[model samples]
Target: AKDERELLEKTSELIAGMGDKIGEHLGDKYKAIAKDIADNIKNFQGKTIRSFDDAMASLNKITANPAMKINKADRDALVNAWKHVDAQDMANKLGNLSKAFKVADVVMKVEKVREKSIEGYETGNWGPLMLEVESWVLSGIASSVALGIFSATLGAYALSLGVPAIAVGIAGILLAAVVGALIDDKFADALNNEIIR
Candidate 1:
């Protein structure tokens, strides 16, 4: 109908508007601030700002009152930049950085755990695979579960419209569940039934 078309056009316009906002307001601001910090970090002797860890340590030293105690005029670009910035924006950026760091840590941990789980399953820690693969299968299922969570979050935050996020989220969950089930050794054989196969 004409009303539906209008609604869609309006939605597209809204998305374009939001894209501009994200690029101009959020993305650009963050990049500028981050770049300033990165440059400051790079200037420190024996410092290699290759990772968040290095950046964080440098930031900490920059703000310490009695420690390095470098003069305020040329102490650090990131700290000086921080002092002049909006309080809420500073907090939000810090929060985002914190979340990113935590996510990176968890993802690395998951990779290590999955590899160990696969090793265990392969070594028959779970059981022999006469009728079913079992534990190795379980590791595969866990990976699918992790991927499902990843994709669902991406769908909610990265693509399409906010109003449709719930539906997209539900679909991601359902599909992840279906795929995760298929990764299980017990279900692998069962999943191959004629109707499913």
Candidate 2:
């Protein structure tokens, strides 16, 4: 009991010695960096920026007839629809989103490093978590697609994409987990510069 008390006292002293540095200068820096990265990443990688509706129509048709393979006619139709969507427009939207995702990924990576090294936050290898993030983002796409279709108020449209809701749901779960991880205290501290510079 005495040993534990001594340790607590020492920890308190160590924290107290840091003064306003704990919450102001150092902490603010880390927090700002983390937020900046997170926002930038979201901006860069948000692919659903422009609704891929026309290209999606092809997918909807294919889904409606899952057993039917894409014959030359179907393939041509898809290609034609894709043409209607200006490539330049897609490039602008998806391109930026891709960039955002990449930057966000970098922010997450640095946070992982900070957690392991400075804060002693336990995070295993990032590989698994990355895979999870992919799943999540995919889920968001799927869910958005389904919701779009359902809200179209067009029954035929709703019947278009035969993709399983389960898959989309799983994707959403993965995405939520990744987002949750991103917003954690460890990430906040790493981004905000609460740790030793």
Candidate 3:
């Protein structure tokens, strides 16, 4: 009985360590990087950085060119900053910019996609990653589009106004099933991988 109690205590301590990690996640350290990335996006003309579409477009421009693309570290900055930065101001901006992010909040889901994107990489089961990317894309929060990830096929469909939202949703799922036989919407797997990286 004493050994079991000691074991339980040790397990509880381990879980407490994990809880601390959740709190100590890079939120504060990277807030500046996040802001800086936003600032760089703002440096471009005719677009307010906070507006999700404009920022996404600028990023797309950067990634579009292998030669001309401005942001490789810049791309890393965007993804990593979004991954780690946390604050009311940043969260507000993230949410405000990503308003159509599946009619969802960017605060949690953004981190979630990256986290699961990493999961997909490890397990090679990209279903969850794909699902999140679809909502992000359909919602017009295609930061990954800037990275030129889904441009192959998803770009054709995702950018097409003729396609209904639900149609893309189904098509993405079908695509994922075909790709990995796993994860969320199939097409988003690509975006999530970008986010994941």
Candidate 4:
């Protein structure tokens, strides 16, 4: 019982000393919050965080989502969401949130790169193929003539030559052309053979 009392006394002193050192510069409410946060940081020792959004959502359980708009809106929202909770508990919640931001930064960069690559593909040969397909659909022309134009167009060669064409390549483009023509023919035949109502 004596030893336990001594340990408790020491812990109290440590907490008081830390509170004085860190909370002195903050306002009364913020000071108490900071001190409490400092005291409870150890509770999050074994936790892991995967993403920033996930951390924010987890912390949001403490308070409703914020509505303010700003560059740091997400960060601010997360902090706001935890503002009413015990500061120490909020600190532990925000701990994984910090890790989440780091991971999220990398993910954000990767997404930007992905967007750029997709844009490049759209601007490249894919654009021509899209235009050709659009024309084919809109022309309402005979299938054999359409196939001839498709096979001879830049879009056909472009579609056949891309990295994604490895499995079928030129043959796939040619096959698509033939298949498109066949489908058009079948529709034409149906229309031609329709009985008068």
User: Which pairs, if any, clash in model 1?
Assistant: none
Encode model 4's per-residue lDDT on 1-197: one tens digit a residue: 23323322333333334334323332243234323432332222222211233322322222121221112433333223223233233224323433321221333222332233233233322233333433442555222223222222212222223222222221222222222222223322221222100
**On residues 94-179, what C-alpha lDDT tens digit does candidate 3 reach at each position?**
33423322223544554555565445324444456545555555566433332122211221222221323333332232222222
Candidate 1's C-alpha runs over 4 A off are 1-104, 126-179, 182-190, 194-197
Estimate the lDDT of model 4.
0.28
The best candidate by TM-score is 3
What tens-digit string does per-residue lDDT give for candidate 1 at 3-122? 323322332332233334333423443223323322322222222112223322332322221422333332232223223333343334323533331222344333333333233223
Using TM-score as the yardstick, the better of models 1 and 2 is: 2
Candidate 3 CA-lDDT value? 0.32
Candidate 3 wrong stretches, greater than 4 Å: 1-90, 95-103, 135-197
Model 1 accuracy (lDDT, Cα): 0.28
Please, what is the TM-score per model? 0.18, 0.22, 0.24, 0.19
Task: Tell me the number of clashing residue pairs for each predicted model.
Answer: 0, 16, 11, 0
lDDT of 2 by residue, 1-197 (tens): 23323322332222232222222433454334334433422233222321233222322332233332334443343333323333334334322433321222333333332232211112213344333333433555332222211111111111222323432222222222223232232432332223322
- Candidate 1, number of clashes: 0
